[PDB]
Amino acid sequence: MYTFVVRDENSSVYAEVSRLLLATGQWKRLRKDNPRFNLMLGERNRLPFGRLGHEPGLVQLVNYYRGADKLCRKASLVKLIKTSPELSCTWFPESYVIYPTNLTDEREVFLAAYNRRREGREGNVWIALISSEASELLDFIDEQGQVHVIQKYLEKPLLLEPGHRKFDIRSWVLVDHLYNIYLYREGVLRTSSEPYNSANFQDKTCHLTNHCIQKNYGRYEEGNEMFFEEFNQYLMDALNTTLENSILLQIKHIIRSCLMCIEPAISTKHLHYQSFQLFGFDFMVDEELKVWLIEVNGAPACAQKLYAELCQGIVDVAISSVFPLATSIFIKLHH
Amino acid sequence: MEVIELNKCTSGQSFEVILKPPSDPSLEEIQKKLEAAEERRKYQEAELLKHLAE
Amino acid sequence: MREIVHIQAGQCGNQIGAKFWEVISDEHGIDPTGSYHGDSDLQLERINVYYNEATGNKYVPRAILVDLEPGTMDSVRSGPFGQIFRPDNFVFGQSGAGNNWAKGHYTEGAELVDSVLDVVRKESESCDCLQGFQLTHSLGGGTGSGMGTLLISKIREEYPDRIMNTFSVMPSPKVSDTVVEPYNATLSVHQLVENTDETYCIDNEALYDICFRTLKLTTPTYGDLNHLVSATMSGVTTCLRFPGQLNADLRKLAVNMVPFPRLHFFMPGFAPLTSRSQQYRALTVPELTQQMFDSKNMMAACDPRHGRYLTVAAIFRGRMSMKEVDEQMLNVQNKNSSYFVEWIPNNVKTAVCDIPPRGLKMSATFIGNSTAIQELFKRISEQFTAMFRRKAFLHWYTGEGMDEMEFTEAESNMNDLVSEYQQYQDA
Amino acid sequence: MRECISIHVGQAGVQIGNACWELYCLEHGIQPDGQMPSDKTIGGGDDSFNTFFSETGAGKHVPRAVFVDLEPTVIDEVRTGTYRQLFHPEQLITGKEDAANNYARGHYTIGKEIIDLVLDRIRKLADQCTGLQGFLVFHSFGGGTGSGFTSLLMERLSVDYGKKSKLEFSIYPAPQVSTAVVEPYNSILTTHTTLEHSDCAFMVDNEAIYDICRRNLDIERPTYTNLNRLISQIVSSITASLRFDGALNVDLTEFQTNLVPYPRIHFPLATYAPVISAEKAQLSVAEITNACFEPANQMVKCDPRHGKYMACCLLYRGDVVPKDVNAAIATIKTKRSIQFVDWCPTGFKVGINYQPPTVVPGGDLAKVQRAVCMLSNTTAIAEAWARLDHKFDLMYAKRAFVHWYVGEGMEEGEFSEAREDMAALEKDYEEVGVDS
Ligand SMILES: Nc1nc2c(ncn2[C@@H]2O[C@H](COP(=O)(O)OP(=O)(O)OP(=O)(O)O)[C@@H](O)[C@H]2O)c(=O)[nH]1
Ligand SMILES: Nc1ncnc2c1ncn2[C@@H]1O[C@H](COP(=O)(O)OP(=O)(O)CP(=O)(O)O)[C@@H](O)[C@H]1O
Ligand SMILES: Nc1nc2c(ncn2[C@@H]2O[C@H](COP(=O)(O)OP(=O)(O)O)[C@@H](O)[C@H]2O)c(=O)[nH]1
Ligand SMILES: [Ca+2]
Ligand SMILES: [Ca+2]
Ligand SMILES: [Ca+2]
Ligand SMILES: [Mg+2]
Ligand SMILES: [Mg+2]
């Protein structure tokens, strides 16, 4: 009889996972502060990693990699890609980290590249707000307070037809305790219902493809979400190519590069406790069918349609692999 | 990258390699503590003996 | 060398006390004459804890025998190991206590108590470093209950910095002598709550049920019940009698088992349950571990699943794999972690002794501080109140000068004890 | 030459003391009867080994050590053991009854009645020193004597020997071999009291040593004898520089200078390699140096990758030359996560002793041609404080077992004052170790 505890009631993913564990009858849920657990579905912040792996007679597993925030924090991701010999790449938009005036920092470096754009008469649209003036951006950062990241806004994205629609690709990636990298075969496209506008950047509604902001909603596809089977068919009909060739190869490449980079820092191969984690990679595709990494989410939600399959997959290769009970939905990105 | 202060002898040797440059209570007080605790013990024992006498 | 002074009072106290000395004398290789004839060196390593030494290498139990009537102590002296006891340590009266707490505590017992304290004093003055006292007695009678608790109070007065430990037999209507037993028990519990550090609660109800159901004894006698008691007492004192790291003395045991001063009443347990009927098949370590935690092996007639474990001490005896012992002990805690308080980390401690008890290749003894023990006190409290509300049988006590208010106070304190257990059961 | 006095307190301190001095005798060629054939200066001298051993006119080399326990059982085994002739009775101090795993009992009640006797016996050893460096104090965190009396002794040593350094070898409590439930209490109480009186403390987690003995020595259920022989090897690696000719850590103050930039943060993490079973029928400099950054070889299980280094020292014994070390370090640096604080240089202080580690004949440890002990002051060791403080908080919130301490004359407020000091300590590690 395996045991586990829950310390994130707000996780839609692991609320489903814990439900499946109970359905097996071989898993029992304990109170939050009960130390005698095999599995910990931890909290998003201040997870007590230092207290794990010190219970004799217990193999302990946690659903988060300590140090993965380096990849999942926007300010950290930029620092990571720039300062890592393995990463410093063509698949990440030009980015700089900016600290407010009242709060080292690369502001004079960002303006250095800003000059080439304006004195080159090319694309000089950037995103924090999406403005073409560095003044309107910096004045916005100092006014907020928190640390913001300045990134080149891809002005020429791939547009869905009909509708001239902008989109982003979400990929779910599970990394187990052996640091096997598993890409869920089912991804999702978060689409904009409004037509893409080139002139007015003030209307961030069509530019931002967040599901919450979108919610013209549900006109084309249900819930402003296009899945891979439909999107593949689109690419075959419109561009005479497949999703695997034009996009997924790049996606699998980027995921490998990012996760293999930080592997020696976060691996629990010889640790007194073991980790796995579900990641949410967000991608951007331009008109030349080139894939750009936007960000990595450490605590991602899933598509309502895909919760049942993904969460079961998490139980099978990440949890039951460590705790065996008495084809695959994942693509193993080997290394 | 840089080995400095190499000292050698028959028993062995020692050195330093740098990879990157940088970027009380008195005796009386103690006795006072010990005596304060002793008296608290004495007080508790006295209360017990008083209770038992009752 | 930390000497313990043993005291046994009343009929029950002397009968389980005698049996106890009989059992551990055999374990330590001491014959009824008092001469050593064992083979292992481990037997004599810590024999000073319970035995004094006389010239000619004679070993005399540091035991004091007390009763307000000579009957039971006459039988002890005629018993198998009757000659091993120091004749000076027999302190007895003639009047008896008539199953009356007041007689033991206030009238008949008060006349004899100084004589006992004289013997206690003489034994203590011969101790290099006395660690404390252990008392065997019942709570349902007069001498063991009344005079026994009077002795404890007077011993605490003279030796306030020593550990007081008791094996206290709790009354049950299933195995009852008189109807005033809940009175005597409640009055005694009041005393034990304030004046002992450790009390092993030995329930006659549990002893009866074990003999009847598990041991298949159709009509168990006190002898059958005492067979279980002596086996349990042997187990719980194992760490005191043989070299070891865990709970090797009375104070270290109390520090590990008692988180709150009033909550010091322990549920003892033993495996395998044997009839006074030899066993040929030795139990595996998982079997010993599973049975020792089973309610059917508890000596307090309380269901530990109805409460929570504050602290647990486990003692495995015999030649076995300590690795397998650790694995099995951790397994019990991990499967049933809901029954162990989380606000006391690692509250389960395990010890292993190489010397098994007679007739067994291995055994396990369980000592638990569970909040489920409140069921025992609630049982007594209800039996108490049923009579006291009608003031039934009270004249036996007021006739000895006691007032009703003393009964009310005793009842109030025991009820408080119950609520304190419930408090930490919901903590 | 400057002398060092060792002080062993409580069962853990004493039993580890015997393991260490037994090992010392084997390393220096000292026979159990105190004789040392290779010592030509009879009944005197100022060699490096004289830091730990004094000499009598009869050619006997006796340890500059005092053994103190509130119970006679453990030290009595020293009085009748194989190395009984090594010590003289004045060095071996025993009380009548112990502190019963109660800090308050060891510190206040029993400590008060025996502290002057202990200090006087120490004074006798110090009077025989031409130039005393200071003291090495061996004790457990969880024991009543190890926690309670040690803290009192450390206070009194600071008064009697203000200029002298004080080093600690402390046994951090682990449930697998623990014998008390209140050990977190004792740990915090003694850490609070000893904190300002200790210049450098090497914590050893019994959990770490336990698992190493199982994993690497194939011992199913490790005993104290198993644990202590491994511990004594680590202790020997740390003190070898004081006992042998060398240029690194040849003095007690150097430990503080090289490992402790900030006084309160004086708990260096020790890592040792290789640990090879004697029953099993040779690792290079690169391999054993790489093992120094494996949590499975550390004296305290924690993750240095998620902390910062303030200082690092490499102590090699055996067939090792500087070229091998530098090549090894160069490879490791580009292979692992080694972050130093900004205000400290990123580097290693290396010490090599050509004499390979000595093992006890018929022991569990195999003879190796080269070994290494890494001492690194990393903020990751604060994980051990966090674990300990959490267990403290769980019990103290209910005031569990507190009456045992108050009963000995200690005030309840000392608990909170001790816990607040630990909270401050955890904050100190946070500021030094984390970015934001
Ligand atoms: N490594 C090691 N740890 C030990 C040894 N003896 C005891 N310990 C540990 O130290 C703690 C027990 O404290 P002790 O040192 O035995 O207690 P003490 O210092 O004698 O103090 P008292 O309470 O008076 O007995 C537990 O965590 C034990 O696991 C030993 O020989 N080696
Ligand atoms: N450089 C860029 N070029 C084009 N679009 C961009 C962009 N940077 C961000 N976006 C748009 O912003 C949207 C969401 O931004 P982002 O995901 O960084 O915010 P967020 O992290 O608060 C949402 P979540 O983390 O939950 O996925 C994306 O759908 C994308 O279309
Ligand atoms: N287990 C056990 N219980 C006993 C024995 N003798 C008496 N009792 C119980 O003890 C209570 C009677 O007290 P008793 O010791 O006879 O009175 P005392 O001699 O005045 O102390 C009743 O609850 C009996 O069931 C015995 O030998 N064994
Ligand atoms: Ca009379
Ligand atoms: Ca008299
Ligand atoms: Ca000499
Ligand atoms: Mg009777
Ligand atoms: Mg001790």
Coordinates of N, CA and C in Angstrom, one line a residue, chain A residues 29 42 50 53 94 99-100 106 130 174 182 187 189 193 202 231 299 302 307 310 314 321 330:
Chain A
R29 N -4.2 8.3 0.5 CA -3.9 9.7 0.8 C -3.8 10.0 2.3
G42 N 3.6 18.4 -4.3 CA 4.0 19.6 -3.5 C 3.3 20.9 -3.9
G50 N 14.4 20.3 1.4 CA 15.4 19.9 2.4 C 14.9 18.9 3.4
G53 N 13.5 12.8 1.7 CA 14.5 11.8 1.6 C 15.2 11.5 2.9
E94 N 15.3 37.6 -29.5 CA 16.2 38.5 -28.8 C 15.6 39.1 -27.5
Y99 N 15.6 46.0 -15.0 CA 15.1 46.3 -13.6 C 14.6 47.8 -13.6
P100 N 13.6 48.0 -12.9 CA 13.0 49.4 -12.7 C 14.0 50.3 -12.1
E106 N 20.8 45.0 -17.8 CA 21.2 45.3 -19.2 C 20.2 46.2 -19.9
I130 N 3.0 46.0 -25.8 CA 3.6 45.9 -27.1 C 3.8 47.2 -27.8
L174 N 6.8 15.7 -19.8 CA 7.0 15.0 -18.5 C 8.5 14.5 -18.4
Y182 N 9.8 13.0 -21.8 CA 8.6 12.5 -22.5 C 7.7 13.6 -23.1
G187 N -0.7 18.0 -28.4 CA -0.5 19.4 -28.0 C -1.7 20.2 -28.3
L189 N -3.2 24.3 -29.8 CA -3.0 25.6 -30.3 C -4.0 26.6 -29.7
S193 N -9.3 34.8 -31.9 CA -10.5 34.8 -32.6 C -10.6 36.1 -33.5
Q202 N -2.1 48.8 -30.0 CA -2.8 49.2 -28.8 C -3.8 48.1 -28.4
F231 N -4.8 20.7 -37.1 CA -3.7 21.6 -37.5 C -2.8 21.0 -38.5
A299 N 4.2 25.0 -13.7 CA 3.0 24.4 -13.2 C 1.9 24.7 -14.2
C302 N -3.9 21.7 -18.2 CA -4.1 21.0 -19.4 C -5.4 21.3 -20.1
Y307 N -7.2 16.0 -20.2 CA -6.9 15.7 -18.8 C -6.8 14.3 -18.4
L310 N -3.6 12.5 -20.2 CA -2.3 13.0 -19.7 C -2.0 12.6 -18.3
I314 N 0.9 10.3 -16.6 CA 1.8 10.8 -15.5 C 1.9 9.7 -14.4
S321 N 6.2 3.9 -12.1 CA 7.6 3.4 -12.5 C 8.5 3.3 -11.3
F330 N 3.3 9.0 -24.9 CA 4.4 9.9 -24.9 C 5.4 9.6 -26.0

